[PDB]
């Protein structure tokens, strides 16, 4: 069980870690989150009380270092930092734990809510999408644009998701125009899986990271990427059976976790109706189709 | 963007453009089978690809053999159209290639865009106009070459005959669209109007009769009467 301590909480803020969200008052005696499960990536996110504009946060893995949060009054945000002096961090953390100044990441008895959302998500792949090599953790916020968004403007602050474009030479073999556009299996299996991602686990990891960025930060380009990666599979007639079964599980838990009041904008009607009811895989996503029809029958 | 009445004179500026109409590519007769079921039999079709400034018509004849053993023919027809338009463009010298291709039906946009990925600087556009190019097979000489074809064939025509010697391309296109709208509305009457007087001849190298300027005004007036009269009865207007 690991710990993300805080130097203090000078401004009133809603903090979230994964699916949990809690409020900290201005200058409240708050010094962090303990009992964070080892083995998973995590995200610690912020929304200030005064300016609900800009949700922001940090993806991290406690196995990669000792991370703490401190409010910067110049830049006006809570910053993640790394403390390399392990003995000092241990002392700072023991101090806070003895004074009971930390909230407790709960352990729930039948709970796989976070694992199922982050199964294929790896810190090393996050760090290639979010390029800031001097830190072991990755900052994301509501406004960051994707590489593909910038092709249609600060490169350092971009989300370098794999570009997917159904009307592109990469997607369409000369001489197979109709074939490749109506059945995207070539583009899925040879261009993307074998060529770019190398395996379906890395594909699913980027799909899961995109969803989580879209959901926790309202990153429009993350939402675009998540739906593009779903649509590329559903629009492929030839998909390995294990991938379809895992996609169904992935999407089920994403749809399950989605706040009901954000579905209106977080779900793209066209993609989901095409995916569930018109595509090659219309009959391959039983769990996802069942939860969608019972939770969001309006979209369909 | 989309082409409509507001940007109508753009058709006659000096950027090369082509209209593409696919409505006569896949053509069938529907008939009964010996068992009392229904079947289709394909007949030859054509892509109507037209430069509205010059009158140059690239009539790609679509022979029924292209459908043999194929499924989902109405979908295939759109892709075949886009394949043939892309081949046409590639066959033209760079300085003759269009800057825009305007499709008469929106279902042609994605097939043409995908086939033209190599030409990112050719704009593929729809239109809000309800152009009557489907009636092109009511022009006797075009129908004849389509139905006689025994293999794939491209035939080149000027759909304006020699009109551009005496009128502008705006006026020529307006006359063409009036004639075609008339033929689409009431083919028999329209054709009677055109070919009732025997002294007026269609030259061997032309599609339409050799009307004097005065006769074209009468003709054009007669086509309008046919068309608004028939708009006339369609609605009780
Ligand atoms: C207080 C301060 O400046 N640094 C610090 C504080 C916490 Cl919570 C953890 C590690 C460090 N370095
Ligand atoms: C139910 C529960 O304990 N929620 C929660 C989780 C964290 Cl991490 C911090 C504060 C709260 N309230
Ligand atoms: C402005 C805004 O809410 N954009 C947006 C963001 C996400 Cl994540 C998904 C869909 C939309 N429309």
UniProtKB/Swiss-Prot annotation, chain A:
Cellular compartments per GO CC: cytoplasm; U5 snRNP
UniProt xrefs under CDD domains: Aar2_C (cd13778), Aar2_N (cd13777)
Keywords, alphabetical: Cytoplasm, mRNA processing, mRNA splicing, Nucleus, Phosphoprotein
Effect of residue 236 to A: No effect on interaction with PRP8
Cell compartment(s), UniProt: Cytoplasm; Nucleus
Chief location category: cytoplasm
Record-listed Phosphothreonine modification sites: 257
InterPro entries: AAR2 (IPR007946), AAR2_C (IPR033648), AAR2_C_sf (IPR038514), Aar2_N (IPR033647), AAR2_N_sf (IPR038516)
Short name of any one Pfam family annotated for the protein: AAR2
Highest taxon listed in the record's lineage: Eukaryota
Signal found in the keyword field: no
Any single biological process term in GO: spliceosomal snRNP assembly
Location of Phosphoserine modifications: 236
Region Leucine-zipper, annotated ranges: 244-265
Post-translational modifications: Phosphorylated on serine and tyrosine residues.
Role summary: Component of the U5 snRNP complex that is required for spliceosome assembly and for pre-mRNA splicing. Involved in splicing pre-mRNA of the A1 cistron and other genes that are important for cell growth.
Quaternary assembly: Heterodimer. Interacts with PRP8 (via RNase H homology domain and MPN domain), competing with BRR2 for the same binding site. Component of a U5 snRNP complex that contains at least the U5 snRNA, PRP8, SNU114, AAR2, SMB1, SMD1, SMD2, SMD3, SME1, SMX2 and SMX3, but is not a component of the U4/U6-U5 tri-snRNP complex.
Further details from the record: Present with 7330 molecules/cell in log phase SD medium.
Family, similarity comment: Belongs to the AAR2 family.
Protein name in the entry: A1 cistron-splicing factor AAR2
Species this protein is from: Saccharomyces cerevisiae (strain ATCC 204508 / S288c) (Baker's yeast)
Curated annotation (Swiss-Prot), chain B:
Other comment: Present with 468 molecules/cell in log phase SD medium.
Effect of residue 22 to N: Reduced growth at 30 degrees Celsius. Strongly reduced growth at 16 degrees Celsius
Domain-related comment: The MPN (JAB/Mov34) domain has structural similarity with deubiquitinating enzymes, but lacks the residues that would bind the catalytic metal ion. Contains a region with structural similarity to reverse transcriptase, presenting the classical thumb, fingers and palm architecture, but lacks enzyme activity, since the essential metal-binding residues are not conserved.
Impact when changing residue 105 to K: Severely impaired growth. Reduced growth at 30 degrees Celsius. Strongly reduced growth at 16 degrees Celsius
Signal peptide span: none
Location relative to the cell: Nucleus
Superkingdom of the organism of origin: Eukaryota
Effect the entry attributes to changing residue 23 to A: Reduced growth at 30 degrees Celsius. Strongly reduced growth at 16 degrees Celsius
Function: Functions as a scaffold that mediates the ordered assembly of spliceosomal proteins and snRNAs. Required for association of BRR2 with the spliceosomal U5 snRNP, and the subsequent assembly of the U4/U6-U5 tri-snRNP complex. Functions as a scaffold that positions spliceosomal U2, U5 and U6 snRNAs at splice sites on pre-mRNA substrates, so that splicing can occur. Interacts with both the 5' and the 3' splice site, as well as the branch region. Has a role in branch site-3' splice site selection. Associates with the branch site-3' splice 3'-exon region. Also has a role in cell cycle.
Residues of the full protein shown: 1836 to 2069 of 2413
Name of the protein: Pre-mRNA-splicing factor 8
Region spans: RNase H homology domain: 7-237
Assembly: Component of the U4/U6-U5 tri-snRNP complex composed of the U4, U6 and U5 snRNAs and at least PRP3, PRP4, PRP6, PRP8, PRP18, PRP31, PRP38, SNU13, SNU23, SNU66, SNU114, SPP381, SMB1, SMD1, SMD2, SMD3, SMX2, SMX3, LSM2, LSM3, LSM4, LSM5, LSM6, LSM7, LSM8, BRR2 and DIB1.
């Amino acid at each position: 069980m690991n710990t993300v301590p805080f130097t203090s909480a000078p401004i009133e803020v809603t903090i979230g870690i994964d699916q949990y969200s809690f409020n900290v008052k201005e200058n409240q005696p708050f010094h962090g989150i303990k009992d964070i499960p080892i083995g998973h990536v995590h995200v610690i996110h912020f929304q200030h009380a005064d300016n609900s504009s800009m949700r922001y946060g940090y993806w991290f893995d406690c196995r990669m270092g000792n991370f703490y949060i401190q409010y910067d009054p110049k830049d006006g945000l809570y910053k993640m930092m790394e403390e390399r002096d392990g003995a000092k961090f241990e002392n700072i953390v023991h101090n806070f734990k003895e004074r009971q100044m930390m909230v407790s990441y709960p352990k729930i008895d039948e709970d796989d809510t976070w694992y199922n959302l982050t199964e294929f998500v790896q810190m090393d792949k996050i760090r290639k999408i979010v390029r800031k090599d001097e830190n072991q953790f990755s900052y994301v916020d509501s406004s960051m644009t994707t590489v593909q968004e910038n092709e249609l403007s600060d490169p350092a602050h971009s989300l370098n998701y794999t570009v997917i474009n159904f009307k592109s030479r990469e997607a369409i073999r000369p001489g197979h125009e109709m074939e490749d556009f109506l059945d995207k299996s070539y583009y899925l299996n040879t261009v993307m899986l074998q060529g770019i991602f190398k395996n379906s686990s890395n594909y699913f990891g980027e799909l899961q990271f995109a969803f989580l960025n879209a959901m926790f930060f309202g990153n429009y380009g993350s939402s675009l990427q998540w739906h593009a990666m779903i649509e590329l599979i559903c629009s492929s007639a030839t998909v390995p059976k294990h991938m379809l079964d895992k996609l169904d599980e992935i999407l089920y838990y994403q749809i399950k976790t989605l706040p009901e009041q954000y579905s209106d904008i977080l779900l793209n009607e066209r993609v989901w109706n095409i995916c569930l009811y018109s595509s090659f895989q219309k009959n391959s996503l039983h769990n996802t189709e069942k939860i969608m029809e019972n939770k969001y029958p309006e979209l369909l | 963007g989309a082409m409509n009445s507001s940007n109508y004179a753009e058709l006659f500026n000096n950027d090369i453009k082509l209209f593409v109409d696919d409505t006569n590519v896949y053509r069938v007769t529907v008939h009964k089978t010996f068992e009392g079921n229904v079947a289709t039999k394909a007949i030859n079709g054509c892509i109507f690809t037209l430069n509205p400034k010059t009158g140059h018509l690239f009539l790609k004849i679509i022979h029924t053999s292209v459908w043999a053993g194929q499924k989902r023919l109405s979908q295939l027809a759109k892709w075949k159209t886009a394949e043939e338009v892309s081949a046409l463009v590639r066959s033209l010298p760079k300085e003759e290639q269009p800057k825009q291709i305007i499709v008469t039906r929106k279902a042609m946009l994605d097939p043409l865009e995908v086939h033209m990925l190599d030409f990112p600087n050719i704009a593929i556009r729809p239109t809000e106009l309800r152009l009557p190019f489907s009636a092109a097979m009511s022009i006797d000489k075009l129908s004849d070459v389509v139905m006689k074809a025994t293999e794939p064939q491209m035939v080149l025509f000027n759909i304006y005959d020699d009109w551009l010697d005496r009128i502008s391309s705006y006026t020529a296109f307006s006359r063409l669209t009036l004639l075609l709208r008339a033929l689409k509305t009431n083919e028999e009457s329209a054709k009677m109007i055109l070919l009732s007087d025997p002294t007026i001849t269609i030259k061997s190298y032309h599609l339409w009769p050799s009307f004097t300027d005065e006769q074209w005004i009468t003709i054009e007036s007669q086509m309008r009467d046919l068309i608004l009269t028939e708009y006339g009865r369609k609605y009780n207007v």
